């Protein structure tokens, strides 16, 4: 098994997303989880996001049924300003504002998640939390795949995945994965559309040199729903005891969302001799996104709309059933070039076997935004009272009306025009000194992250050149009985793009995490079990000014302590299992307002279990029947902890039938169902005016062929 390739069972022993060097997960001192291409081709995820529900320590409903972004909340933490923190092949997909990219799961070989500080090898990063996707690469043997989807909400995807070699020796091979997927969103009137193709090509001038060219070109005319809904009408009943339907849409009829992605790069390794191997990863990309959208702000009786005129023009006891709305027109575009180069030194010194890593990582990102935002009374209120029982059962709600957008009035709105620039360069060193049954990993990294933002309208330019250092130390006790005890100390760091009252960019926040755990990785069977418990802390977090002045004051702190366990196995050539449990206790240690409060959108309890079975005998030969469930506990739906979003449990199940029995081995047809008991839940709220209906039971019929 190769960190950059498949894994046989959904139990991957080898991963590189932790030490930058291909290593057994047991020998890795930090919490790593790996979702196989197999595990994915089991649920037919819509996004890398969804592909992560049986993964401890990760929420994915931080936006309910919406998939515009693979924004995740790992260990109760996430990037500042709702941006992602997603990596693709050891290089970060740095985005900014509504400009974050996503890669389709069907072009991925595996999706990996590293919990805890990751700055030691990657640079600036949100405390505890990284996602790294592995592009699919050329296969050893030919691959002729054609896949056909068809599911609820008029979902229809048609894609392929091919790979072969030009010569007979394989010095020249490639791969071309691509798909066309279209469907209707959960919310009425909203649509989803994606067109993606991934060209790959690997030159192996021998058996010590490897150069894979990895490109991904994606285009999405319409990205789907991305609006907010009041706790009033979702989590809590509306005045008239009725709630808004799960498919209710509060945005304009002419609401539009689009994103375009284009990236070319390569991964390359070369082994010179017995002690030195060099590898370099590089990617350039330019991505754009534009949108015309009317989102929602709470009900008129919601504090936020305190200064809304249209709101304060309704009978004082009529405000709790009317919705305030705002809008935004955006159109951005950014380029992101990245390169990582590293030298691996394999040598010893009297029984101390060494694996020393030394490397420089560099990147720059430039984003140009030209948006427009609607403020109070910027768009006609909505009488939410209407959605009743005729909108629930006997049909669903109806698409509201168009909206202007073009006629940007100076009263209700104004312009937003910024140009954020980003640049980071870092050097790191790490040694995987294995001294017999005592693998001890250690290393650190220095960083030069400089930023610069130009506000067009305001004609300003704030900029800050941060320089930080991070290191991580840990040990793993290799027991021959499979068990591998371990513990480690790690650090992270993340700059602020925010400006203080002193007209200056706040100094970055930090991350310190203490973690210990056990990794069961028996060499005989294909089963992996990991358990771990940690104490993660975020420093210098921004908090409300003690004097209250529109400007926030740094100094706040937050702690995240918890326990995580996950398990994936191959209990039989017919039985396969995956499950996990997550205990997450996140708290404000220091903060002007909130303190001791739990951050919204992060539940204390989370657990998931899923198992499949394939019959290789009875008249049900070539038949897999699988099912599972994901549980998310109650969570606070706003910083003040005003209310709570109620816990829920959704069931998943599937059935596949190996089409071999019709002269088509390797092929098959499958049926996947999510939220089997078409449950109704509220994924979460990030505030009183921002709640998201969970995904309403979905069913997909997939046929995938292998020539």
Q: Is 486 annotated as a binding residue?
A: no
Tell whether the torsion through CA atoms of 677, 683, 688 and 690 is positive or negative: negative
Q: Is 601 annotated as a binding residue?
A: no
Q: Is 705 annotated as a binding residue?
A: no
Q: Is 532 annotated as a binding residue?
A: no
Q: Is 629 annotated as a binding residue?
A: no
Q: Cite the beta strand spans of 435-497 per DSSP E.
A: 438-455, 460-477, 483-494
C-beta of residue 48 within 8 angstroms of C-beta of residue 105: yes
Q: How far apart are CA 128 and CA 76, in angstroms?
A: 9
Buried (b) or exposed (e) across 11-50, using 16+ Cβ within 10 A?
Answer: bbbbbbbbbbbbbbbbbbbbbbbbbbbbbbbbbbbbbbbb
Q: How far apart are CA 191 and CA 182, in angstroms?
A: 8
Coil, strand or helix at 321: helix
Q: Is 695 annotated as a binding residue?
A: yes
Q: Is 75 annotated as a binding residue?
A: no
Q: Is 296 annotated as a binding residue?
A: yes
Q: How far apart are CA 626 and CA 42, in angstroms?
A: 9
Quote helix, strand, coil % in the chain, to nearest 5: 5, 55, 40
Nearest alpha-carbon partner for 362 in 383, 337, 334: 337
Q: Is 63 annotated as a binding residue?
A: yes
Coil, strand or helix at 304: helix
Q: Is 373 annotated as a binding residue?
A: yes
Q: How far apart are CA 28 and CA 486, in angstroms?
A: 8
C-alpha distances (whole Å) from 686 to each of 9, 149, 238, 589 are: 37, 33, 19, 20
C-beta of residue 685 within 8 angstroms of C-beta of residue 235: yes
C-alpha distances (whole Å) from 583 to each of 186, 193, 602 are: 30, 36, 11
Q: Is 304 annotated as a binding residue?
A: no
Which residues share a beta bridge with 331? 290
Q: Is 97 annotated as a binding residue?
A: yes
Residues annotated within the binding site are 63, 82, 97-98, 226-228, 295-297, 373, 695
Residues annotated within the binding site for ferrichrome are 63, 82, 97-98, 226-228, 295-297, 373, 695
């Amino acid at each position: 098994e190769s960190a950059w390739g498949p894994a046989a069972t959904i139990a991957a022993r080898q991963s590189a997303t932790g030490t930058k060097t291909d290593t057994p997960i047991q020998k890795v001192p930090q919490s790593i989880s790996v979702v196989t291409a197999e595990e994915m081709a089991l649920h037919q995820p819509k996004s890398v996001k969804e592909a992560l529900s049986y993964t401890p320590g990760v929420s994915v409903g931080t936006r309910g049924a919406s998939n515009t972004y693979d924004h995740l909340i790992i260990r109760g933490f996430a990037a500042e300003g709702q941006s992602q923190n997603n990596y693709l092949n050891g290089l970060k997909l740095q985005g900014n504002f509504y400009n974050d990219a996503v890669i389709d799961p069907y072009m991925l070989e595996r999706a990996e998640i590293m919990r805890g500080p990751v700055s030691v090898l990657y640079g600036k990063s949100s405390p505890g939390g990284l996602l790294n996707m592995v592009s699919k690469r050329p296969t050893t043997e030919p691959l002729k795949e054609v896949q056909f989807k068809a599911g609820t909400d008029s979902l229809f995807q048609t894609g392929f995945d091919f790979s072969d070699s030009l010569d007979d020796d394989g010095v020249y091979s490639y791969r071309l994965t691509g798909l066309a997927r279209s469907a209707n969103a959960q919310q009425k009137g909203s649509e989803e559309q994606r067109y993606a193709i991934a060209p790959a090509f690997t030159w192996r001038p021998d058996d010590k040199t490897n150069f894979t060219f990895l490109s991904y070109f994606q285009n999405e005319p319409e990205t789907g729903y991305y609006g907010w809904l009041p706790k009033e009408g979702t989590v809590e009943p509306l005045p008239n005891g009725k709630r808004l339907p799960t498919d209710f849409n509060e945005g304009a009829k002419n609401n539009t969302y689009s994103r375009n992605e284009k990236m070319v790069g390569y991964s390359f390794d070369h082994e010179f001799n017995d002690t030195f191997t060099v590898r370099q990863n590089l990617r350039f990309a330019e991505n754009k996104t534009s949108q015309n959208s009317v989102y929602g702000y709470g009900v008129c009786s919601d504090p936020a709309n305190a200064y809304s005129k249209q709101c304060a023009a309704l009978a004082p006891a009529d405000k709790g059933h009317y919705l305030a709305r705002k809008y935004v027109v955006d159109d951005e575009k950014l380029q992101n070039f990245s390169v990582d180069t590293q030298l691996q030194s394999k040598f010893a010194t009297g029984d101390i076997d060494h694996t020393l890593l030394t490397g420089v990582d560099f990147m720059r990102m430039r984003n140009d935004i030209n948006a427009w935002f609607g403020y109070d009374d910027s768009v006609p209120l909505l009488n939410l009272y209407n959605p009743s029982s005729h909108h629930h059962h006997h049909h669903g709600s109806s698409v509201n009306t168009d909206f202007d957008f073009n006629a940007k009035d100076p009263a209700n709105s104004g312009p937003y025009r910024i140009l954020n620039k980003q640049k980071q360069t870092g050097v790191y060193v790490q040694d995987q000194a294995q001294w017999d049954k005592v693998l001890v990993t250690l290393g650190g990294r220095y960083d030069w992250a400089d930023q610069e933002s130009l506000n067009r309208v305001a004609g300003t330019t704030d900029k800050r050149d941060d320089k930080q250092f991070t290191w991580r130390g840990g040990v793993n006790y290799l027991f021959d009985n499979g068990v591998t005890p371990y513990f480690s100390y790690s650090e992270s760091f993340e700059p602020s793009s925010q400006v203080g009252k002193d007209g200056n960019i706040f100094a970055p926040s930090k991350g310190k995490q203490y973690e210990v755990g056990v990794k069961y990785v028996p060499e005989d069977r294909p089963i992996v079990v990991t358990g771990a418990v940690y104490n993660l802390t975020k420093t210098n977090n921004l908090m409300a000014d003690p004097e209250g002045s529109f400007f926030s004051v740094e100094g706040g702190e937050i702690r995240a302590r918890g326990v995580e366990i996950e398990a994936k196995a191959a209990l039989s050539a017919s039985v396969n299992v995956v499950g996990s449990y997550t205990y997450t206790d996140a708290e404000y240690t220091t903060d002007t307002t909130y303190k001791g409060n739990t951050p919204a959108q992060v539940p204390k309890h989370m657990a998931s279990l899923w198992a499949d079975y394939t019959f290789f005998d009875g008249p049900l030969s070539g038949l897999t029947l699988g099912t599972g469930g994901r549980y998310t506990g109650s969570s606070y739906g706003d910083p003040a902890n005003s209310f709570k979003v109620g816990s829920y449990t959704v069931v998943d199940a599937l059935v596949r039938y190996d089409l071999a029995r019709v002269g088509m081995a390797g092929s098959n047809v499958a049926l996947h169902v999510n939220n089997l008991f078409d449950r109704e839940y509220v994924a979460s709220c990030f505030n009183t005016y921002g709640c998201f209906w969970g995904a309403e039971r979905q069913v997909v019929a997939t046929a995938t062929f292998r020539f």
